Amino acid sequence: GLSVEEIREAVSGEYLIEPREEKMVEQVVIGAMSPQSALRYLREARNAALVTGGDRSDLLLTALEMPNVRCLILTGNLEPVQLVLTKAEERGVPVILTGHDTLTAVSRLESVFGRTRIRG
């Protein structure tokens, strides 16, 4: 398992929503395309992080309701809508923004596991 801070480090990201406590991330789900597909992958993942575009509002809001989502990694420097930030703050789920594109973010993250990179 990896800490959120280490994940932020790997993608040279920044916190839009800071964690209030330290929580481990065991798997990373790539939700680049179909939201229904990303959610199906998240269902099979424990203590997972979701990597997707900060513009994917509906997907992010649904993801923020799952019990197993521990972290959001937003790509393309796309700042999400207020609703997402508010829900993440309420849920206490850290939100990391990275300038990297989905592909590059994945490359960097794989360099920190690989078998723990599902979805896509």
Side-chain angles (χ1 to χ4, degrees), residues 1-111 113-115 117 120:
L2 298 178
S3 80
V4 171
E5 180 54 47
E6 303 179 79
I7 286 174
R8 189 191 64 60
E9 175 181 300
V11 295
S12 304
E14 69 191 65
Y15 291 116
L16 291 195
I17 298 290
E18 281 180 290
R20 290 199 280 279
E21 65 189 309
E22 178 59 61
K23 284 193 178 181
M24 300 302 274
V25 173
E26 298 177 13
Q27 280 161 281
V28 174
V29 171
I30 312 309
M33 302 169 94
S34 174
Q36 51 167 177
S37 177
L39 291 168
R40 185 176 295 97
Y41 287 119
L42 280 177
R43 277 196 285 286
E44 302 312 312
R46 49 185 179 181
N47 300 312
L50 174 72
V51 180
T52 186
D55 63 328
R56 309 294 295 289
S57 308
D58 291 346
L59 169 60
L60 296 168
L61 293 169
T62 304
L64 286 172
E65 298 293 4
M66 327 196 46
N68 59 314
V69 176
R70 303 269 168 287
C71 181
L72 301 184
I73 303 165
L74 309 181
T75 58
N77 280 315
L78 294 169
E79 291 174 46
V81 298
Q82 187 55 52
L83 244 288
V84 174
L85 293 177
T86 295
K87 177 57 67 168
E89 171 79 324
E90 295 179 340
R91 290 273 301 114
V93 173
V95 175
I96 292 168
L97 182 63
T98 180
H100 284 148
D101 54 292
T102 316
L103 199 296
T104 305
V106 172
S107 298
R108 298 296 181 286
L109 291 168
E110 292 182 302
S111 302
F113 257 176
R115 52 158 183 169
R117 187 280 293 182

